[model samples]
Target chain A: DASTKKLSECLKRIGDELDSNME
Target chain B: NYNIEKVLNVYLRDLRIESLNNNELEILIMIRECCEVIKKDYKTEFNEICNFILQNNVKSCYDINDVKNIIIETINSDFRPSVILASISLLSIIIKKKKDENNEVVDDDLALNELINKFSSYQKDIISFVEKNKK
Candidate 1:
């Protein structure tokens, strides 16, 4: 496994947060 | 096959040799080293190490991406190349994209552009990180 599977989870959260202000 | 070890070795060598705030650099080394071992074999061992480092070596001060950007910056300065160009090269390799008949980047222009614009600014942080370690 690339563990990219493990790591991209972090980036998805980061990318999503960049789109939202309230949470 | 992945050659993860090669990338890890180069960075680990530089980080170990050049030096930085001892503790922080130590953590970076460990993370890289843990990856190196996992490339060989780690699975459960790797996560435990990461959790251990997170709880102890790096406390509540910074999140994961902060650590990632620090590494991106730190590595480019050592590469002694155009940080922006190098960052794009890195993004091109990793970021998800579409493929043409030759399977190179043809579509995903807007998607790729976003990361280029967003990550380019961190070159400043990279320079600052190296200079701050001046000793």
Candidate 2:
């Protein structure tokens, strides 16, 4: 199972990383 | 605005995103389509970072630093920055498949191949879907 939470968690982490890394 | 937001909702909705189920081809195609919608709206702001994998199917950078440099540079010039950033990051994970190892670095090449196979199967479904539902 791809488990929605996992992708969402991973996606959010990346989003958070991008934000922190950029600005 | 071309009702781009509506297109996004159609493409990126949580339910639609959920439907991908980490299937290889589904993930790749969705990333491709997500990139497409972003490209459709902001042509100049986009980068070919995705092409490093989607087209060339090549590992882009040696490490995470190199990874961000390409993606970070790619995203810095845009409104869809995080959207593209995450998209690129996700695809990069599939390609490089490492954290300390690519994106978080798991079973090395497993993610990419599985995603590719899944992408193919999912695409087959999509092709059938198009023919079956003309609405």
Candidate 3:
């Protein structure tokens, strides 16, 4: 599960996007 | 997963490539003892990834290709580019030396690239939002 969509999803929920997010 | 691990130790059990590089010099140094350390870690990560998938009935191929892809696509994209490069480079040199007993440890200049390339490309697909679900 190393930094996969799960983390991305959490980040998205928290409004803290990651590199894969669109600015 | 490339966190604070050393070059020799990284591949001690598996190969963890940070990026894809076909450069002769770079490839030549990626299959020796040094890279083996990363290979070990890379393998461990892959196994863990496989187990993670298997838990949900989503079995993995368990092959090098599948493992590599999983790490690259899911684990860490910027792996072999720099981190794995350094480790493999070291191990590959050792492998080259092994091939020729009188080469004084000369570089292979391209010992093994595509083989490793396909192996360190992506991470596996994890299950649902369980406690160990990438939290």
Clashes of each: 0, 12, 42
DockQ of 1: 0.04
Can you write out model 3's per-residue Cα lDDT over B48-105, one digit (the tens) per residue? 4344433433222122222233333422433323233322332333343234433223
Cα displacement (angstroms), candidate 2, residue A12, comes to 12
What overall lDDT, based on C-alpha atoms, would model 1 receive against the true structure? 0.34
Q: Pick the candidate with the highest TM-score.
A: 3
Off by over 4 Å in 2: A1-6, A9-23, B1-34, B38-89, B92-107, B126-135
Evaluate model 2: give its lDDT. Answer: 0.36
Candidates sorted on TM-score, descending: 3, 2, 1
For model 1, the superposed segments whose C-alpha errors exceed 4 Å read A1-5, A9-23, B1-90, B94-105, B129-135
Model 3 chain B lDDT-worst window of ten: B122-131
DockQ of 2: 0.12
**Which CAPRI category fits model 2?**
incorrect
For residues B15-98, could you state the per-residue lDDT of candidate 1 as single tens digits? 243334554455344434433332333234324423432443233221233234433434333333223223332232222111
